[PDB]
């Protein structure tokens with residue numbers, strides 16, 4: 001019965017979610033970079 | 046679609062967001078446009094991919 005009191009810990013499970021969310025947020029943000037080109041949009045060029 | 050300069054592709058649907066009278070369009074987390082305001086009718090529309 002004392003186990004519920006200690007809960008109401010799971011940081012190892014939240015870290016897995018965070019690591020993937022951070023890689024997906026970074027992957028999308030890397031599309032707004034010019035990398036030394038005139039623009040960052042393949043139609044505007 | 047093109048909303049006063051914003052060039053893109055997607056499905057237009059009725060939104061439930063509320064822009065501040067001076068704002069034309071909104072962006073989501075990760076900095077991508079997700080809602081616009083029609084210049085002619087002044088209605089807020091979501092853009093789904």
Ligand SMILES: *[C@@H]1O[C@H](CO)[C@@H](O[C@@H]2O[C@H](CO)[C@@H](O)[C@H](O)[C@H]2NC(C)=O)[C@H](O)[C@H]1NC(C)=O
Nearest residue numbers: 049066067068069082083084085086087088089
């Ligand atoms: C832009 O002009 C159009 C003209 O068609 C306006 O649309 C009319 O607006 C009045 C005022 O509410 C309505 O009574 C009419 O029924 C509308 N016309 C149609 C065909 O629906 C529109 O309101 C104007 N927009 C702005 C922001 O001034």
